[PDB]
Amino acid sequence: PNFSGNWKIIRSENFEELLKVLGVNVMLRKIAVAAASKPAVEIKQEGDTFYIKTSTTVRTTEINFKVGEEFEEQTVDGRPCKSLVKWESENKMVCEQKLLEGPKTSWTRELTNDGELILTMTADDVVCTRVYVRE
Numbered sequence: 746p747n748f749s750g751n752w753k754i755i756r757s758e759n760f761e762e763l764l765k766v767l768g769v770n771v772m773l774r775k776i777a778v779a780a781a782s783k784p785a786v787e788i789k790q791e792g793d794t795f796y797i798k799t800s801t802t803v804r805t806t807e808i809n810f811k812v813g814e815e816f817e818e819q820t821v822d823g824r825p826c827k828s829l830v831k832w833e834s835e836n837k838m839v840c841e842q843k844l845l846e847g848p849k850t851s852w853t854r855e856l857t858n859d860g861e862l863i864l865t866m867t868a869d870d871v872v873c874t875r876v877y878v879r880e
């Protein structure tokens with residue numbers, strides 16, 4: 746599927762809990778949660794090549810990767826990692842992360858038949874789920 750476009754958040758579940766179990770300081774956690782409530786998301790996909798920009802004033806993540814080639818990013822709680830994206834199924838990509846020790850973290854993105862984008866972010870047993878619609 747083509748994920749390209751600007752995406753707008755409509756649901757977030759377990760974001761604060763994810764940060765909480767990862768030990769993020771409560772003062773920083775409240776700033777992170779509030780910033781994450783209204784991110785600006787831009788995706789440009791050309792085959793297996795992805796540009797994914799998620800912007801908030803206090804944290805912008807900008808990754809330009811090819812599916813099946815390793816790249817550097819940060820975990821959700823800000824620790825440097827090596828990431829590797831693969832297609833799990835036809836409409837779902839799964840990213841495995843390894844720290845540059847800690848919780849086992851990952852993220853997934855998929856598109857529904859209606860064109861809603863579902864992001865999950867995991868740390869051990871805690872799963873955060875965020876749903877977006879294309880502008």
Ligand SMILES: CC(C)N1C=CC(C)(C)c2cc(C#Cc3ccc(C(=O)O)cc3)ccc21
Nearest residue numbers: 769773776777781784799803804821822823
């Ligand atoms: C207070 C600031 C400086 N801060 C500090 C520490 C951590 C790393 C926990 C932090 C994470 C986010 C975040 C985020 C986020 C992740 C994903 C998405 C998304 O994909 O929509 C949106 C926001 C935003 C701020 C901080």
